[PDB]
Amino acid sequence: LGLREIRIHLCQRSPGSQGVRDFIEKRYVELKKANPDLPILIRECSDVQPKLWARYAFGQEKNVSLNNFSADQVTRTLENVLSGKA
Amino acid sequence: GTSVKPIFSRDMNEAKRRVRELYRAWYREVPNTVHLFQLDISVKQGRDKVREMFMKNAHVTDPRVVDLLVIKGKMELEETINVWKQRTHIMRFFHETEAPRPTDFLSKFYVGHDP
Amino acid sequence: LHHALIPHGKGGRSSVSGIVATVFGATGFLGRYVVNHLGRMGSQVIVPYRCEPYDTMHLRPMGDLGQIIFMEWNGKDKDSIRKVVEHSNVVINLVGREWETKNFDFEDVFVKIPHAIAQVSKEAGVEKLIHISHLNADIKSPSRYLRSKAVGEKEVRAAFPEATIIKPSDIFGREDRFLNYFASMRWFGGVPLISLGKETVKQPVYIVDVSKGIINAIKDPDAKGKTFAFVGPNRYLLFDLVQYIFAVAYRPFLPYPLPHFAYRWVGRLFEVSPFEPWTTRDKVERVHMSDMTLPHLPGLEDLGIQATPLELKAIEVLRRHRTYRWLTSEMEDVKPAKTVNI
Amino acid sequence: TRPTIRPRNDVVHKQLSAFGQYVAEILPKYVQQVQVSCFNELEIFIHPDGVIPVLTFLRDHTNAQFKSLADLTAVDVPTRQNRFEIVYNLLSLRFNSRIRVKTYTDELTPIESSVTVYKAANWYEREIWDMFGVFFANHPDLRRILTDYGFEGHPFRKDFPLSGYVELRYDDEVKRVVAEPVELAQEFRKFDLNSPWEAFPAYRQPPE
Amino acid sequence: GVRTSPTGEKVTHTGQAYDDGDYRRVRFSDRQKEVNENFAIDLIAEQPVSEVGSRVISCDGGGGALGHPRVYINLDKETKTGTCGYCGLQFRQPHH
Amino acid sequence: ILAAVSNIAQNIRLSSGVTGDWKVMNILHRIASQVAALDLGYKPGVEAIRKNPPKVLFLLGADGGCITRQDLPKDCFIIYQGHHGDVGAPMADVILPGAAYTEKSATYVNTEGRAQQTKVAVTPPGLAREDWKIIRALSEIAGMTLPYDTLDQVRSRLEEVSPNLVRYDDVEGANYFQQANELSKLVNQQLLADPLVPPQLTIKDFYMTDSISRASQTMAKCVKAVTEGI
Amino acid sequence: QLIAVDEKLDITTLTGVPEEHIKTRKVRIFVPARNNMQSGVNNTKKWKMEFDTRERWENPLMGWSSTADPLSNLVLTFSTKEDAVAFAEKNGWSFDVEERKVPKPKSKSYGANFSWNKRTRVSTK
Ligand SMILES: NC(=O)C1=CN([C@@H]2O[C@H](COP(=O)(O)OP(=O)(O)OC[C@H]3O[C@@H](n4cnc5c(N)ncnc54)[C@H](OP(=O)(O)O)[C@@H]3O)[C@@H](O)[C@H]2O)C=CC1
Numbered sequence A: 001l002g003l004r005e006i007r008i009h010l011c012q013r014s015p016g017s018q019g020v021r022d023f024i025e026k027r028y029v030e031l032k033k034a035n036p037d038l039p040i041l042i043r044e045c046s047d048v049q050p051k052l053w054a055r056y057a058f059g060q061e062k063n064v065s066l067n068n069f070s071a072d073q074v075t076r077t078l079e080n081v082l083s084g085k086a
Numbered sequence B: 001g002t003s004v005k006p007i008f009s010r011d012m013n014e015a016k017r018r019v020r021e022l023y024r025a026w027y028r029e030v031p032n033t034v035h036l037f038q039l040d041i042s043v044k045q046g047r048d049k050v051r052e053m054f055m056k057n058a059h060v061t062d063p064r065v066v067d068l069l070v071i072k073g074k075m076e077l078e079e080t081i082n083v084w085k086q087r088t089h090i091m092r093f094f095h096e097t098e099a100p101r102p103t104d105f106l107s108k109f110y111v112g113h114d115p
Numbered sequence C: 001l002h003h004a005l006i007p008h009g010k011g012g013r014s015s016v017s018g019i020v021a022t023v024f025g026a027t028g029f030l031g032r033y034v035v036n037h038l039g040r041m042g043s044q045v046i047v048p049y050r051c052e053p054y055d056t057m058h059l060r061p062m063g064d065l066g067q068i069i070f071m072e073w074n075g076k077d078k079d080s081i082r083k084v085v086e087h088s089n090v091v092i093n094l095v096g097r098e099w100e101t102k103n104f105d106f107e108d109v110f111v112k113i114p115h116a117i118a119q120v121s122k123e124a125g126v127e128k129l130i131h132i133s134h135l136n137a138d139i140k141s142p143s144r145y146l147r148s149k150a151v152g153e154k155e156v157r158a159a160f161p162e163a164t165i166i167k168p169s170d171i172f173g174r175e176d177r178f179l180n181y182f183a184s185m186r187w188f189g190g191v192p193l194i195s196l197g198k199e200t201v202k203q204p205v206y207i208v209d210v211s212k213g214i215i216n217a218i219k220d221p222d223a224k225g226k227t228f229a230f231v232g233p234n235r236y237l238l239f240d241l242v243q244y245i246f247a248v249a250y251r252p253f254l255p256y257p258l259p260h261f262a263y264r265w266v267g268r269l270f271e272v273s274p275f276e277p278w279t280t281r282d283k284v285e286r287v288h289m290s291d292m293t294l295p296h297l298p299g300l301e302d303l304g305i306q307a308t309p310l311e312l313k314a315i316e317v318l319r320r321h322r323t324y325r326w327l328t329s330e331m332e333d334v335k336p337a338k339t340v341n342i
Numbered sequence D: 001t002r003p004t005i006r007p008r009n010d011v012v013h014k015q016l017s018a019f020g021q022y023v024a025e026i027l028p029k030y031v032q033q034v035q036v037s038c039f040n041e042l043e044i045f046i047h048p049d050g051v052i053p054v055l056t057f058l059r060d061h062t063n064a065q066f067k068s069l070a071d072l073t074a075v076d077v078p079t080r081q082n083r084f085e086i087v088y089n090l091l092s093l094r095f096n097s098r099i100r101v102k103t104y105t106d107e108l109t110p111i112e113s114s115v116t117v118y119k120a121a122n123w124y125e126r127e128i129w130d131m132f133g134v135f136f137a138n139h140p141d142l143r144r145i146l147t148d149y150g151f152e153g154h155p156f157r158k159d160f161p162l163s164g165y166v167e168l169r170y171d172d173e174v175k176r177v178v179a180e181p182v183e184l185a186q187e188f189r190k191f192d193l194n195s196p197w198e199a200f201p202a203y204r205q206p207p208e
Numbered sequence E: 001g002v003r004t005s006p007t008g009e010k011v012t013h014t015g016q017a018y019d020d021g022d023y024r025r026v027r028f029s030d031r032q033k034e035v036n037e038n039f040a041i042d043l044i045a046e047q048p049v050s051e052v053g054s055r056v057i058s059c060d061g062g063g064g065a066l067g068h069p070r071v072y073i074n075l076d077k078e079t080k081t082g083t084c085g086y087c088g089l090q091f092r093q094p095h096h
Numbered sequence F: 001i002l003a004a005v006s007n008i009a010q011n012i013r014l015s016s017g018v019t020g021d022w023k024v025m026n027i028l029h030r031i032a033s034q035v036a037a038l039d040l041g042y043k044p045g046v047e048a049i050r051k052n053p054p055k056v057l058f059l060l061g062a063d064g065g066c067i068t069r070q071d072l073p074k075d076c077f078i079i080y081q082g083h084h085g086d087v088g089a090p091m092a093d094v095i096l097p098g099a100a101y102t103e104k105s106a107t108y109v110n111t112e113g114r115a116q117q118t119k120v121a122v123t124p125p126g127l128a129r130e131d132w133k134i135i136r137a138l139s140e141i142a143g144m145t146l147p148y149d150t151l152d153q154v155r156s157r158l159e160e161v162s163p164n165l166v167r168y169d170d171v172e173g174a175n176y177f178q179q180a181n182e183l184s185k186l187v188n189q190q191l192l193a194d195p196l197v198p199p200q201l202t203i204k205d206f207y208m209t210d211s212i213s214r215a216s217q218t219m220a221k222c223v224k225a226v227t228e229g230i
Numbered sequence G: 001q002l003i004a005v006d007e008k009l010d011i012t013t014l015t016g017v018p019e020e021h022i023k024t025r026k027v028r029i030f031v032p033a034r035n036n037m038q039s040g041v042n043n044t045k046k047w048k049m050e051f052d053t054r055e056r057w058e059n060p061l062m063g064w065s066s067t068a069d070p071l072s073n074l075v076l077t078f079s080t081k082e083d084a085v086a087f088a089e090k091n092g093w094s095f096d097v098e099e100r101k102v103p104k105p106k107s108k109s110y111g112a113n114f115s116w117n118k119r120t121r122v123s124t125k
């Protein structure tokens, strides 16, 4: 019913992860300041695709593609999952 | 391209034709096999086993592999017809003394370490 | 489980199943199949024998090296039973004679010997005991064979409260007297049946089914103090059963009714043979007695066994009884017999 | 160098080299390589399509006359794209000589049967088919020769296990001999004997 | 140096005896258990230590080519004796 | 302590700049399972156990003696899974025999973050089984069957959680020291007066540290040799 | 005459291997490590393919080591990793490949043993 964790799999040097990288360069810090108890696991990705993961109660998960997303799109998606929407 | 030399068939259509011919020959042979070897199976069981052996290899898409499979099946048919084979050889297809090995996770976990 | 008795391998000939079984009566019809099924999995099998060792030779290839141990025993001796059950976690009892010998009556083989085995194996710390009685065991049955079976069943239950008791009914197989007895009658000319076999119902069971049921009951943790009845999937009138037997053997079937007293006199006449009798009075009583129905007892399907119909395995027993003319006839050519099911 | 070392023969070496050159010049369509081993053993590598011409020329030519086929076998080398190496050994009685002809194939490519050239090949080609799975085209009666009836796979192939996949035993319940998955009381013990120091400098390979 | 286990089974030079709950003992009932009675560790412990007037001694087990490969044993340590690694014989220099 | 060390690293970084890929900051681990656990989202430490004393406890090879039955409520169900009888075994209700590192193909992540996989040398003794297979069978019995049935499927799930756990022998990583330094500057927990003293003060302590080494007679001989001259 | 077959090579149905030993097996393709007890490197030149280790148990008689794995002894030798991969692929075995590990070139200098001011100077020789 509620958020338990977030996983952001970004790829270290692929163009399609570039915007996501910018997010972590600038907007990850204050997002962690706002959510001191939410585990936002930042992990490295292989040549496939950037992704975001959301875990809910009783182990329910689904992922969102972040390929070619700009930093604003990334934070919009993150606030959408962080809010009671979608 | 891929520059291969055939055995008998140039495409899958001829290979399928040969498969059908071999299947016809096995189907005709089964009742004689049951009579000669004095097998305790029915003709229905024998034809079902022939179909099962044919369907084991239904996924093959290479005409050369199909040609070799038909050659092996023809070798087995020739062997059966001439009585080179004994009743033990025919009955080896049915695995009558083999205890059923389970396929679900829990039973495998119980019996041992092999997956 | 005593590390040496932890199962290992793929359940084959060179594997370790964790079973150490002493099989009394392993030199008979059921014993060879039981020992074969135990040695298939890689079990340690201890065979007590009183016969000539030549008669045990056929049991030698049933196990790996060292997996079958042969030991002499005496049914009237309890030190010998102690000697042969000292190291086993399973004891199976298959001791029994259809006819009564001078040194052993029915009460000796069906009461005294089973009770002595149960007492000694309980004393020795044997974990499991499997006893075989009959489906038609009864305290007031006309056959002394079945009366002794019921008495011995009670004695075993008293001496080994956690024993599994199995009650089969007319096992048929390659070396089975029941299938053979009907086949044997053709030499005389006519088949003598009491009331023409129209007042008897039989539910015969396959030998491999009974062996598999015993093996599964060993491996079943909840089958400890249970009582099972092993019966086939079909019930036949005796007349139809014998007619089917004669049709599978391709022999001319000439049934005639014989009165009960005449058949008893014939059985008594055959009883005086110093060798194995062709028939006895007890056999005549047991042949023309209907198989009991015991729906309250667990069956082969509770042990995971799907009963084999006689229509599928009759030819493998009766092809030997054919002449050269009909020796190659197929199995599905004989038109299965009529079943009186419910 | 005298007592324990095998002596050389340069005359036979020269004769075999000249005859190998002869054979290569006469049949350029098929001959890919010619070798003379240090102990005087002539070898001629060819193309598979030339199995029948080459052998025919070798057995019929007046200057060849290799009318006898010693033996015919195959070698499995899994690292090669063409797995199987087909080796023919021929003897000439007129010239008291021997010659080896080698060609290649893989699992799915047939080789021309040479029963027409040599009658002796029949069983040799059947044996190669049985042990290695190499099909021979236009073979009179091609079937297993060495293995058991209904035996699956080819034993001589490098991938095949030494003890196979099935064993046999007599089963009393079915009253016959049955085939079951192999179980071994004692596993064959694999030894690692190869020395970590090089033995023969003359055969050293380039370091890639 | 034979000795029986609490089960009455002889213990071998190796020291292996079947445990009380081990079913495998059934293989000896109505038969016997093969045990070699001449324990080599005890027999070699009875041989007298050879005293030699040199720092380095040689041993080949006796019999020349019928013994073991010839080895050389240093005898400088006086707290112990030089023991052959093949035969087990002991050597020392005259001490005290 | 971590905040102070990160402050030292930050001062170096701002004074000298970043030369490129140097990564001044480093953490030296001593436990084989720690880095993978942290990569999986496991919470480091046993503090949450003391904060919320559980009724059902899963000891997965945990023999450190950190949590005993004095730190738990009564009638607590303790399940121990492992290969050795150590601190964690005799205090459990159910014991599940697992496989040691020599008896499975399993993944371990070292101090560098490099992921490596062991291979089966021998099979587990007796009735012992592979650890993830124990967990999967237990999940099936309880009705919530886990999606993976084989080792490749469980490693696909591993990749789903943390993708770096399937890139054997890869050690490349991204530097996020600036963000971590910012996040560390928030709290200002006070430093203790106690002098920094390592657990392995001397050579004798080095030998017997884990359950495998505590059961080793060779390590006992080594300890006896370093304590007693002889 | 050529027929232009288009599909990937696949010979599993012709090899006669039981399907259990085709689908549940994992092969390892690797250059074996040098035995640390010796300095020779001649056993680190070729690629090896070997199967996964299966269960071994104790024979009740004699206590020998028993197996039910028919591929427990099979080792294949290849010139290059590509050949090993092609063989495993055409035989239908799942494989794990490991890149060849070579010792890095080291700068040796005997005179460094006697450095005037360096730490490399030997305290004994
Ligand atoms: N239709 C059937 O066969 C079914 C059988 N019954 C029961 O199932 C059990 C097995 O039947 P089955 O195999 O057909 O019978 P068998 O006659 O074929 O074998 C009986 C076994 O018991 C041994 N035995 C018999 N008497 C003695 C004795 N006085 N002392 C020592 N050993 C003896 C025999 O040894 P030896 O050869 O040396 O004499 C023999 O191994 C029996 O208890 C039987 O009563 C259950 C329902 C019917």
Ligand SMILES: [Zn+2]
Pocket (backbone or CB within 6 Å): E059, E060, E061, E068, E084, E085, E086, E087, E088, E089
């Ligand atoms: Zn010596």
